[PDB]
């Protein structure tokens, strides 16, 4: 039975790779949209809710100021993000619909996910119970199984990047650090609390950094705060590299065991990175109640369904300062963004 299930996974991932490759070796303009509201911000731009004027459908538009994408690793990453998002297809990955550029900005237009960020729901309620955290963790496990099978590393797992859809399921956003990596890669990037020790130590690293980050995410969902917690990044890094983890007293023993095997500094011991790959995680006792196929098929009733007041509703997002979108008469950085 479990063996038949594992043959079926191999069959699916073989088909998934064929479909990915066909798209990987292979659409609008700004005035086609009304800009409605800022949904989130970052050091290179913002994500806005927009309305497509012709169809009236709503979308999330990520706007990157080509000028602000200045540093070398910032531009390569932007190309990775667009090309990876156009080629992937998985139930828990946000769907890119358009991408285009103008004199000043780069634009990626994605489906709008109206339930808000896991981040704000978690911070409002404090922590998720273990079944609730498990439901989300299962979707990430399957998403990283998919990505990793395509030799894609994600590299920015955190609640800020996990949107809740109308059925209460996860949609992973922000592929800004995602990359095709057959073996190792060397960029020092990601979010401090979620970095694996080997990233912080300037060691060449592989997809096992995503499994470390899953341990951070599960811990943060179930505790309400992450395992390596300090006011400044250098203090966070020190805690990560020591790798000492203490757990809340309400964590089950099965959760602590799983987290000790994910938050493992020794790569020869880290779950997700061993002979049995992702199955050491999927077959762990903490996931014994998880019906992995039913999660993929979205047959499991979600622990939380966001309320939606209609299309274009932004009530599940925080408010941000709005700043007019200015497009220059002079094209900026044309040669550096030719492939976009």
């Amino acid at each position: 039975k479990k063996g038949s299930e594992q043959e079926s996974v191999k069959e699916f991932l073989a088909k998934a790779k064929e479909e990915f490759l066909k798209k990987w070796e292979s659409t609008a303009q700004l005035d086609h949209f009304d800009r409605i509201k800022t949904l989130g911000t970052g050091s290179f731009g913002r994500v806005m809710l927009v309305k497509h004027k012709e169809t009236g459908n709503h979308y999330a538009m990520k706007i990157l100021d080509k000028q602000k994408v200045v540093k070398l690793k910032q531009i390569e990453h932007t190309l990775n993000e667009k090309r990876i998002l156009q080629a992937v297809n998985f139930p828990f990955l946000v769907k890119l619909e358009f991408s285009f550029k103008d004199n000043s900005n780069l634009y990626m237009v994605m489906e709008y996910v109206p339930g808000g960020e896991m981040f704000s729901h978690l911070r409002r309620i404090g922590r998720f119970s273990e079944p609730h955290a498990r439901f989300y963790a299962a979707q990430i496990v399957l998403t990283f199984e998919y990505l990793h099978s395509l030799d894609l590393i994600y590299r920015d797992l955190k609640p800020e990047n996990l949107l809740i859809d109308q059925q209460g399921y996860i949609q992973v956003t922000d592929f800004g650090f995602a990359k095709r990596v057959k073996g190792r890669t060397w960029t020092l990037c990601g979010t401090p609390e979620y970095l694996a020790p080997e990233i912080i130590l300037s060691k060449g690293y592989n997809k096992a950094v995503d499994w470390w980050a899953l341990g951070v995410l599960i811990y943060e969902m179930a505790a309400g705060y992450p395992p390596f917690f300090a006011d400044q990044p250098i203090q966070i890094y020190e805690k990560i590299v020591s790798g000492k983890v203490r757990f809340p007293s309400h964590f089950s023993s099965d959760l602590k065991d799983l987290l000790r095997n994910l938050l493992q500094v020794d790569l020869t011991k880290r779950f997700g990175n061993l002979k049995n790959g992702v199955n050491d995680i999927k077959n762990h006792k903490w996931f014994a109640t998880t019906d992995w196929i039913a999660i993929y098929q979205r047959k499991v009733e979600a622990p939380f369904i966001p309320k939606f007041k209609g299309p274009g509703d932004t009530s599940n997002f925080d408010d941000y300062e709005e700043e007019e979108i200015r497009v220059s008469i002079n094209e900026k950085c044309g040669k550096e963004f030719t492939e976009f």
Binding site: S43, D156, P226, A230
Partner: peptide, 14 residues
């Protein structure tokens, strides 16, 4: 137990 409770920005090169 003091740590960062708001949204966390990613770092690109350091």
């Amino acid at each position: 137990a003091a740590g960062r409770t708001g949204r966390r920005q990613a770092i690109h090169d350091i």
